[PDB]
Amino acid sequence: LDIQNFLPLETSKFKSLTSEYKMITTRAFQLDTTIEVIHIPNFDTTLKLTIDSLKMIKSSLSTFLERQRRQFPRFYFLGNDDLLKIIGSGKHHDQVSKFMKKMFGSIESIIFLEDFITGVRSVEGEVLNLNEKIELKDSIQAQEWLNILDTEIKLSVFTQFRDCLGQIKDGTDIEVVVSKYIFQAILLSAQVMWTELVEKCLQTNQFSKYWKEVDMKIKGLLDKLNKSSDNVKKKIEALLVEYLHFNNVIGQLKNCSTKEEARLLWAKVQKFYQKNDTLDDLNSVFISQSGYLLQYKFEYIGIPERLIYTPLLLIGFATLTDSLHQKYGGCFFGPAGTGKTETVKAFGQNLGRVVVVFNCDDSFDYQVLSRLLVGITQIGAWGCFDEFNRLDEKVLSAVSANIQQIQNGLQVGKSHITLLEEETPLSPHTAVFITLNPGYNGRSELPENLKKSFREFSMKSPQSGTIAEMILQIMGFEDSKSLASKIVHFLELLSSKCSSMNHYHFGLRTLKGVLRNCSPLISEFGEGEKTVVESLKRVILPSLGDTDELVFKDELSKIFDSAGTPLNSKAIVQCLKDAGQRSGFSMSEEFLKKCMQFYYMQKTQQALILVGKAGCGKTATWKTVIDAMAIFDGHANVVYVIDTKVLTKESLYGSMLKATLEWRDGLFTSILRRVNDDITGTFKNSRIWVVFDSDLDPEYVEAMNSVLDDNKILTLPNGERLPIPPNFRILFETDNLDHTTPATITRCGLLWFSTDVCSISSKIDHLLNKSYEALDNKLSMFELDKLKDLISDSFDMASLTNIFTCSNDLVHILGVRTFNKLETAVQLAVHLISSYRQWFQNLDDKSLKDVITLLIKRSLLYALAGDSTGESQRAFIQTINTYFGHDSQELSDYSTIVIANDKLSFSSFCSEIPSVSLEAHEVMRPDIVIPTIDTIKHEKIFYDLLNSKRGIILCGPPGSGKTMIMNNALRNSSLYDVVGINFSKDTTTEHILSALHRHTNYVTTSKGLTLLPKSDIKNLVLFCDEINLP
Amino acid sequence: IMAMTMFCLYKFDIESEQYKEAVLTMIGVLSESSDGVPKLTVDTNNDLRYLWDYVTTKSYISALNWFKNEFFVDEWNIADVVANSDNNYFTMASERDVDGTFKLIELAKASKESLKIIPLGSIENLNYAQEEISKSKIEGGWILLQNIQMSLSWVKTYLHKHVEETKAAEEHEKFKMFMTCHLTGDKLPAPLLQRTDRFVYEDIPGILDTVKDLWGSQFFTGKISGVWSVYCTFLLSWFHALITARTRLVPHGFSKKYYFNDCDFQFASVYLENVLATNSTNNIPWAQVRDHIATIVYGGKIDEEKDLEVVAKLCAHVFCGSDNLQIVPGVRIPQPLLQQSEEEERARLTAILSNTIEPADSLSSWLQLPRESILNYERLQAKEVASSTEQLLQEM
C-alpha cells in the first residue's frame, strides 16, 4: 500500500493493464490449443501495446529512484530492492536502521525516543549521541530526515572533539575523558594535543619531561583496561595503539644527534593541526606530513581495530598523501598479507573517513559497482579496489575506463564528469585506491590508461623488530626494548644457523605467535625475558628436528639466559606415567618429551599439528596426554578421530545440493552441533577433541581457516558462522606437510616427531601385552600364565637386535620399515604359540622350548623377510639360526611341526603333499589348484596371518598365483568367506561398500551401536585386487 | 640477430667449408657455447681475419655490428622509410624509455608539414579523435595517435574496422596516419598490424642531451618560485637524466628494468616547490628532500632492497652539496650567487650545459658505476644475439 501510495499515476496504469491481460490469458487458455491463439483478435496489437506501457512504468520507477538517490547519495550504496523497503517502511522509521549498516559502514542501528532520534550505535558497539535529537513526523520523507542525520552525526563528532580537546588542554587525566567521549573524538583530541605538546618540545628539547609524562598515561591506560567493561575495553585498546605511537616518536626524538635530525623525523610523521583562526568548523582540522596537508573530514568511524604503527605504515600514509596532493590515485601492489587495503582503510580513518572497499571479482556484479562509483563521486568518499587485479577482461576494461573518468575529472577538476552514459557531478573530495596482489606471472599491473592517473607503491612486510617492541609494551613491558631486539636477533639467527627445512618459519608471524603464546605464560611467571624464553621453547622447539634442536638451545642461551627450573615438573609427569602404564606404553626420553611438548601446547593452542614418519607414536602421544589430563584436571575428553581425506569437502564440512539448494550438515559441522546447539549432557565440564588422521591439504583447511583464525567460528559455504568453545580442540596427525601453506602452519601449534618415540624392545613389550589381553577373553588364566612365561624365556632382545639389523641388509618388495614390521611378528608369534596350547600341557620341558623357538623363528622370518625374494628368505633363515642359540631348533625353507590324527604325538617333519586327480571336463575350472611344495607353503602362512587377524598384502608379478593361493585357502575353510573387489585407476570408496552390502547385514546392537557384521554368522574376507591401482 | 643469421644464410652456401667452421667457431666465442681460435690461412680470408680481431680484443658491440656492415646496405631512417613507403598508415613501437612522438614532429616539419598530435585519453579524446581522423584524410594533413595501446578496447571496434574500410584513404588526399605502440605492453590486433607499416624507434639520447632536453621545457612554466628554486629544478633535471641513464644498463646497474617518467620528475619538482615554499632559503633543508625523493617519489616503484639503496646513493650525491657539487667529473655546479637574479641564473645554468662535452666513457665516468661493469653488459647482449642466431639456423 505504501509503494502505490507514493506512486499514484504508476499503480493506476499498472492495474488498468492488469485487467486487460487477465482477460487475454483466460480467453486464450480456454481455447485449448496454443496454435488456436493466432486466430484470436488483437493479440499481437494488445501485447505490443501492453509491453510498451509496462516498460513505461518500470522506466518511471527508475526515474523516481534515481531522483530519490540523487537527493540522499547514500542510497547509491543501497540499490533498488533495499531502497524500496526504506520508502515502504517509512511509516515504521525504525526499520531503516538495518540498511544504515550498509550506507555508512561504521554504524549498525539507529537510536530513537521514537518521535526523536537520540543517536546511533556503531557496528563495533559504540554509542554516539547527537547534539540535537532529530524530530520525526508522518509527512517526512526518508530522504529529508536522513540527510539531517548525516549532517548532525558529523557535527556531533566535532562537538565531542572540541569538548574533549579543550578538557585535556585543561590538564585532565586521560582515564577521565575515556568514560565520557566517543573514541573517534578522544583519538583526534589526543593527536592534536600530542602534536602541539611535541611541536613545542622540538624548540625547547624538553623531551624527557614529556616522555615519562606520556609513558605514565600508557601505564595508566593499561591498568584501567584490565578492570574495564568490554565496550570501553575496545576503546582503551584502540587508544593504546595510538599512545604507543606518540611515545615512540618522542623517544625517537629524544635520541636524535641534532635538531635537523629531529626535524627530519618529525617531517615524516603525520602531524594533526587545528585552525584557531577560522569558521566552518568541520573544516577546522587539518593534517601535515612531508610538507603536505590534508583536511580532516568529520565522518564517524566508530571504534575500528587500529593498525599498529610501523615506520613502514607511515611511509604508506606518506605515499598516499603524496599522490592525493597532486590529485592522483593511490595504488599499492605487493604480496597478499601485506595489508595494503588495511593501510588504505587506516589512512582514511586517520583523516576521518570510512573508505569503501570493493572486493573485486568475488563474483561481484559490474552493475552494483557502477552504482557504487556514482555514489562515491557524489558523496565525495574514498573507494578502494581490494585486489583489483582479479577482474575479468571485459569487466576490467569497463571498470578501468570509468575510473579514468573519475581520476581525470579530479586532476582537471571538471565540475561534472560523464561516466555510465550520464552527466553526474564530481565532488573533489573523491579518490580511488587500487590494491594489486601479484599474479602467477609476477607483480600485477595497472591498465595503461591508469598508469598516468595513479601512483604505484611496493608494499613490503614490516621489519619485525618494531612490531615486537610494541606488543611487548602492551602486555606489561618490563624491558620491552631489550626483548624485542633480542627475540628478533635470535629468530634471525636461527634462520641463518638452522638447516633449511620445509616447515621452518622464523619470520614475524612466528614471533607474533611467540608473543601470543606469551600472555597466559606471563600469568604463570613474569612480564620478563624469562617468560619470553619459555614461550620460545614452547613454540620454536616442538617443531625443530634433532640437529636444529641444539642450534636453538645453543643460540637461545647464547643470546639470553633466564632460568634454572620448571614448575609443573612432578605434577603432569606422574599423571603421564600413570596414563601410559595403563595404555601399555613405555616412558622413554623421547616419548616423555613429545608428550610434554604437546601438553604445554594444548594449553595455549586450539589447533595442533603432529608430523612424523608412519609409526612415530603420534596417536600414542596425544592419546596418552589427553588421557593424563582426565587424571590431573578431572575433566572428561570426547574424541572424534576423522580421516580427513576419506570424505569429500561436502561430506565433511557441509554440502549444499545443486538445485533445491538444501542445507544438510556433513560430518565436521555436525559433531560441533552436539557441543554448541544442544549441550544436553555434560559438555561444559568435558574436553572435545576433533582429530584428523589423514593427509592434510589446502582445499580442506581453507574451508575451515576461520576456526584457525583469531575468530574461533566456522563459516558455512552458505548461511552461517558457528562459534567454537575453548573445549573444542582440533588436532592434525600426518606424515608430511609439503602440501600445506606456511599460513596454515603458523595459525596452529606444530609438533614435529623427529624419530620414533620408543625403543624396539619397548614396542614389542607393549605389543605382547596388548596381544595377551585379547587372549584372556578366549584362554584360561592357568593356560595364559604359562604361555606368557614361555614367550619371555624363548626370545630375548639381544638375539633379535642383530636379526632386525640384518633385515635392512636385504631387498624388500613393497617396502615397509623394520619398526612397522614388529606388530606382524608379535601377533603371529603369540598366535602360533596359542595354537599348540593343549600340547603344552603334557609335553617335555626341553621339547616344549623347541616348539616355541621354531615358531618364533618362523614368525620372525615372514615378518622381516616375508616380502623378500625367498632366494633372500632362505638367506635370512640361516641369519636367524645364526643369531639365535646354535643348538636351538634350526629353521629350514620348508620346516614344519606335525601332530597325529588319532593320538597325541610330537615330531617335526616337512614337505608332504597331496596329489590331485581330475577328469578332462574338470581341467579348467575357476578354482583349481595342483598342490605344490609352494602351494601348501604359502597357503599355510597366508592362513596363519588371518588367524592373527593382521591384514595381508600379497605382492608379486601377474599370474604368480597370489589370487589362487588366497582363494583356494579360503574357498576350502568353513571359518572365512570371500568377497572379491577388483580395483582400477579410478575406483570409489562406495564401490567397496556396494560390494559389501550384498554380503553384509547392519544390526543396531547396544554393544557397538551401529555395526556392520557379515550377513551370516562366520568371518568375512574382502579380497581387494589391484590395490596399488587407484 | 637478423644480421648474423642472414650473413650465415648467404656465406655458408657461398664460401668454403673452412670458412663455415671458422665463423661458427667465432659465433661460439661471443656466445658461451665454446671459446676457440678459427682456421688461419695467410691472405686466404681478410674480412674474417678482421672480425676475429674484434672478438679477441674483447670488444663486443663492434663485432656485432660487423655482420650489419658486411651487407653493404644503407640503413634506412624513419623518414626514408616513410617516403619510400606506399601506405597511409604506420605503427611505430618503442621501449618505454623513449617516445618517437617528438621525432615525428621534426619528421613532418622537414618535409610535407601537416602535423597533428592526437592523444587518446578519455572518452572526449577518443570522441574528438574519431572526428579528426575522418576529416584529416579529406584535408590531407598528417595525423598521430599517441600511445594507442591504452585506449585499445576502442581500437578493435572503431579503428580496426575504420582503417580496414578506408580503401578510400587510397583515394583520399596525400595523408599519413601514425600510431605509437609500446613493445613491452598489450598486444595490438595482428590483422590491423600486418596491414600497416611498422617501425621501432630505437633512438636513445645521451645523459647531457637528456639533461638539456629536460631543462629546455622548464623555462616555459613562468615564475611562481624563488631564484633559488631554478637551481633545484636544475639539480633534478640532472638527477632524472642520471637514473634514466642507469635504467637501460641492467643487470649491472639496476637489478630490473624500471621505468621513470615525466610524472616522476613532476611529483619530485612539486615536492621541491613545496619545500622551498614552506622553509627558509638557508641551504640545510636538504636532508628530508633526499628521503622523500629517494623513497616515495622515485623509490615508490622500487621493490628490491638492492635498488632502493641505489636511488638513495644517487640522492646522496645529486642533492646534498655545499658550494660545489661536481655532478659529473667534468662539471661542477655552484650554489646560487649573492647577485640573486632568476633570469641570470637560468642563463648561467644553461651555460654550464653548453660548456660541457659528454665524454667517451660516459656510462662509467658519469654514472658512478665501474667500467668493468659496462664491458660485462656489452658481453651479455653479445651472448644474446650470438645464441639466438645459432638457435635459428639449427631450427631450419
Ligand SMILES: Nc1ncnc2c1ncn2[C@@H]1O[C@H](COP(=O)(O)OP(=O)(O)NP(=O)(O)O)[C@@H](O)[C@H]1O
Ligand atoms: N599351483 C598351480 N597349479 C596350477 N596352475 C597354477 C598354479 N599356480 C598358478 N597357476 C596358473 O597361474 C595363473 C595365476 O593367475 P592368477 O592367480 O589369476 O593371477 P595372480 O598371479 O594371482 N596375479 P594378480 O591376481 O593380478 O594379483 C593361473 O591362470 C593358473 O593357471
Ligand SMILES: Nc1ncnc2c1ncn2[C@@H]1O[C@H](COP(=O)(O)OP(=O)(O)OP(=O)(O)O)[C@@H](O)[C@H]1O
Ligand atoms: N612407548 C612405547 N612402547 C611400545 N610401543 C610403542 C610405544 N609408543 C608407540 N609404540 C608403538 O607404535 C604404535 C603407535 O601407533 P601410532 O598410530 O601412534 O603411529 P603413527 O606414527 O601415528 O602412524 P600414522 O602416522 O599412520 O598415524 C603402536 O602400535 C605401538 O605398538
Ligand SMILES: [Mg+2]
Ligand atoms: Mg596413527
